[PDB]
Amino acid sequence: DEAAELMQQVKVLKLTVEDLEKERDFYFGKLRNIELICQENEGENDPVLQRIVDILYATDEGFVIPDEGG
């Protein structure tokens, strides 16, 4: 029953995919909403948004990702 076990695997895998897909873009649209607050207040009123833009472009990786936070 080689493939039979793999049938279970694609199922548990795809379901993890589906729940992860939803979350990825669920919060992804959220960062934009926080960035939209930034576009409103950056330089205009509140500098706090500047350091939250830093969040949306904070890349904790091995390689240093080039970004421009302004």
Q: Which is nearer to ligand C05, 50 or 57 (CB)?
A: 57
Binding of its own copies at residue 30 (CB under 8 A)? yes
Instruction: Judge contact between 26 and 38, C-beta under 8 A.
Output: no
Q: Which is nearer to ligand C05, 37 or 57 (CB)?
A: 57
Q: Pseudo-torsion of CA 61, 63, 64, 67, nearest 10°?
A: -80
Binding of its own copies at residue 69 (CB under 8 A)? no
DSSP state, residue 1? -
Q: Which residues bind ligand C05 (CB under 6 A)?
A: 31-32, 35, 56-57, 59, 65
